[PDB]
Amino acid sequence: ELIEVQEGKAKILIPKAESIYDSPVFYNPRMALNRDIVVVLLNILNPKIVLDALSATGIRGIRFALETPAEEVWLNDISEDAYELMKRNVMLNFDGELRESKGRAILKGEKTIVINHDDANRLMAERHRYFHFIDLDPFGSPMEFLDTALRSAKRRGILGVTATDGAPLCGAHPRACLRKYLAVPLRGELCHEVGTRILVGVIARYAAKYDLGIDVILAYYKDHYFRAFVKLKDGARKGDETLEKLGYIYFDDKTGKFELEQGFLPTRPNAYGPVWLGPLKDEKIVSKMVKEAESLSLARKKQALKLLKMIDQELDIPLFYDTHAIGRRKKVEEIISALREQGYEATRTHFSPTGIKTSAPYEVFIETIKR
């Protein structure tokens, strides 16, 4: 029936089954890294009232309460069996008695834990402008909840969205991408960043009508999923400035050369987007994350540090050059060094193991790898 496992400072019971998609209550251990990062981040932004929209086993919210400054943690899931496993796992990491009720339970101890058996769109809708932080971790696309989450979070709240929607976001299913994200995807060596930027840009677009803009705290790709942490800005002016960060991409698949164009609409044919052409991180914050992550007991510390450091030293410039792909048409360390000697900025990128982000033009990049 149930197996007791441990993640971070959390001890939970998960159903034992053939695969993760076969257990009555979902739990993907590979997502431990995803939860480490949000924990590291929360230990910086220090949100007071947080929400684990689609909790499943309750692991995320449970780690929120045990490993972060969060004072009021809300756990929610539409599934009855999940709700029951959530209540159990909560009482497995916290003391006192759970004052349960019809599909709703509460625990008022050092931290306040609100466990809910409800539909996320229903809960969030009841909780208008209530959370400092909301974490959306759905099966694939978050579009079904995005709009309601933008109304449930404080006008200055933080929104965490994950998208395991690789197929549409990476160009495999262009028509599916158009329906869910209202953007024309780009496949190929760049689809990892473009997919991430499409994600940020759709949040930016949905937030604008509430006269809200965004600041990307951190956005990255990893293990086939897209993560986006954004800070909401109050004001039509902020909203307008956000939409101004949107743009389109032009890509020559024969050469690997790409071009960017800032604007709500493109002005040339064969445009990819719209996508977020703004920053993909808040360097000041990401740097602290590396420091914080080192002083925390995460579930996958080594990988968490390895990923955070990569992003920390990474250039925040749109797109990059994949040495392997272009090669088809030397070592990355050597190319980077040769680029820096000439005075250009160049760094590795978490998007690709052979990718290089640089301020050098396509042409110079090609000349340099040839020398």
Ligand SMILES: Nc1ncnc2c1ncn2C1O[C@@H](CSCCC(N)C(=O)O)[C@@H](O)C1O
């Ligand atoms: N409308 C809805 N409201 C609340 N939960 C929903 C929902 N639609 C689907 N779900 C569900 O979302 C799941 C996503 S799996 C989620 C995992 C996670 N947060 C972690 O770190 O483990 C299931 O438990 C489930 O029943």
